[PDB]
Each structure stands twice: as structure tokens, then as C-alpha cells.
Design a protein around this ligand. Structure first.
Ligand SMILES: Cc1ccc(O)cc1-c1c(N)c(=O)[nH]c2cc(Cl)cnc12
Ligand SMILES: [Cl-]
Length: 269
């Protein structure tokens, strides 16, 4: 039977063998898949509304495997309702499989940039920067660190808005993060809310310049200093180059916070 998963303290007939997910949802399309599992766009058979549902691939190996997957629901609940964060509707487990039902969002910022095959227009980038900064400011005011800010985890909303999602790595002040967007202080085992600001800086640098970020090597080292590659950052404006330099400050003690960036004249919007 389905077990509701939470940390805040009709249609389904258990008589027949199909799982609750097959029984209560219309599989419209698969939005993504991987080692984690699958994500589907669904239409709920109870209200007709559209949602996105992510399910794990294989049953729980053990208690640690279960608590690891279930922690995403807890991390998602600690964030709470915010306009710039993907809203979790409900989560449950059945047959050792964990299901997460959220609101339906547009394509990810990674998909959006790949579809255009070029640098996003700078007015479009400022909106994505501000919206994700607002999301990080919401997380960081609660002592939460996302630790996986990247274009694949930023999802478009209507009229040029975007929302921050995938809170599976979120920690309250750790697993392996993406090295392309990793803040330098994480190498020494030092984490804080400043790590998300750096990852957002590399995220904006990727989408505004259409450059692939290095997984390692010297190019990875150069981005963790104060050095922007003049080959790719040539097209940026003065205001945008100024903001990225502050977000990419190597010293987390000196790196600007999300609240500080949002108070700047260009981002005060
Ligand atoms: C289902 C889900 C759960 C948690 C989360 O943090 C985000 C999503 C998600 C959405 N809410 C969405 O609209 N599209 C997606 C596309 C992919 Cl490939 C992956 N996850 C999602
Ligand atoms: Cl390296």
C-alpha cells in the first residue's frame, strides 16, 4: 500500500494490483530519466490538474538507502512555499519506490539554452539571475544550503520566470556535487551559504556566454581565482561582468551574499 512520506509531525482502489501511481495518474510523457529514476508529466485522475512526478528506479536496498531518498522530501519541506521554488505537493512510498509529486514547470534552464544554441539575451539572463537569487535568499535565510545550483536544476515559469528545484542535496547548516559548478572552498571540506552564490555565478556565466564549464584541469582552476576567460566573457556588459566577478569571489569570507546582490541597482528590479 502507499505510505505518505512527510516530516511535518477516492480513485485509489487497493483491491486490484496496479500501483497507486498507475491508478491515480495519467502518464502524459517522460520529462527525464537517469540512475535516480524517472520523471513524468502526469494528469491527475482526481482533479484533472497537471503535475510532474519523480519516482526512484529500484526498491530500497536498506534503511540507509531509504533514509537517503526520503531526506529529499524533508529537505523539500524545510524550504516551504516560495514563488521561486518548485512547490512539492505530496510524496509517498510503495513497493520500496519513492514518489514525489510537484507542480508542473517548464523546461530546465539547461534545456532552454540548448534549444537556442546561443547565449541567452542579457535581459532574459537578468531575470533568471534575480529569480534564482530570490530563491537562494529564501533558502539561506533559513540556514539551508542547496549545494547543487546548476542550469539543470532551474526550471522555467511562465512569462520569463524560473524556479529553483531538486533539493536532494540540500543541507541544514553531504553527497558528491557537480564539480563544474563547485565552489573552491568545498575542496577543503568547507561549506556554507556562500557556496550556492558561486555555483549560481558559474551557472550565469555558462548560460550568458554559452561556454561549457570544465570538469577539472587548469581551466577549472582559473575560474576559482578572480580570472574570467576573456575569450568568452567579451560580450558581457559592464553591469553583468561586475555582478559575476562578485559572485565568483574565491574567498567565501569576501563573497557577496544573495541578499547583498539583490540590493544592487541592477537587481533591485
Ligand atoms: C518532479 C520533480 C521533483 C522534485 C523537483 O525538485 C523537481 C521536479 C521536476 C519538476 N517539478 C518539473 O516540472 N520538471 C522536472 C523535470 C525533470 Cl527532468 C526533473 N524534475 C522535474
Ligand atoms: Cl583539477
Amino acid at each position: 500500500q502507499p505510505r505518505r512520506v512527510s516530516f511535518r509531525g477516492p480513485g485509489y482502489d487497493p483491491s486490484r494490483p496496479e500501483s497507486f501511481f498507475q491508478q491515480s495518474f495519467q502518464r502524459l510523457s517522460r520529462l527525464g530519466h537517469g540512475s535516480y529514476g524517472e520523471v513524468f508529466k502526469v494528469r491527475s485522475k482526481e482533479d484533472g490538474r497537471l503535475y510532474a512526478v519523480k519516482r526512484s528506479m529500484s526498491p530500497f536496498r536498506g534503511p540507509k538507502d531509504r533514509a537517503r531518498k526520503l531526506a529529499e522530501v524533508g529537505s523539500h519541506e524545510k524550504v516551504g512555499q516560495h514563488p521561486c521554488c518548485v512547490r512539492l505537493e505530496q510524496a509517498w512510498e510503495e513497493g520500496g519506490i519513492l514518489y514525489l509529486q510537484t507542480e508542473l514547470c517548464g523546461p530546465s534552464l539547461q534545456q532552454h539554452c540548448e534549444a537556442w544554441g546561443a547565449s541567452l539575451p542579457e535581459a532574459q539572463v537578468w531575470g533568471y539571475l534575480r529569480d534564482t537569487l530570490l530563491a537562494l535568499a529564501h533558502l539561506h535565510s533559513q540556514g539551508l544550503v542547496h549545494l547543487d545550483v546548476k542550469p539543470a536544476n532551474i526550471f522555467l515559469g511562465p512569462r520569463g520566470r524560473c524556479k529553483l528545484g531538486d533539493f536532494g542535496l540540500l543541507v541544514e547548516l553531504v553527497q558528491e556535487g557537480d564539480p563544474r559548478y563547485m565552489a573552491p572552498e568545498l575542496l577543503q571540506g568547507s561549506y556554507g551559504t556562500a557556496a550556492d552564490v558561486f555555483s549560481l555565478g558559474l551557472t550565469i556565466l555558462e548560460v550568458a556566454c554559452n561556454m561549457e564549464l570544465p570538469h577539472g584541469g587548469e581551466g577549472w582552476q582559473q575560474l576559482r581565482q578572480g580570472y574570467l576567460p576573456p575569450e568568452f566573457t567579451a560580450g558581457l556588459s559592464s553591469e553583468l561582468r561586475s555582478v559575476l566577478v562578485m559572485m565568483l569571489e574565491p574567498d567565501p569570507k569576501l563573497r557577496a551574499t544573495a541578499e547583498a546582490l539583490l540590493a544592487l541597482p541592477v537587481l533591485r528590479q
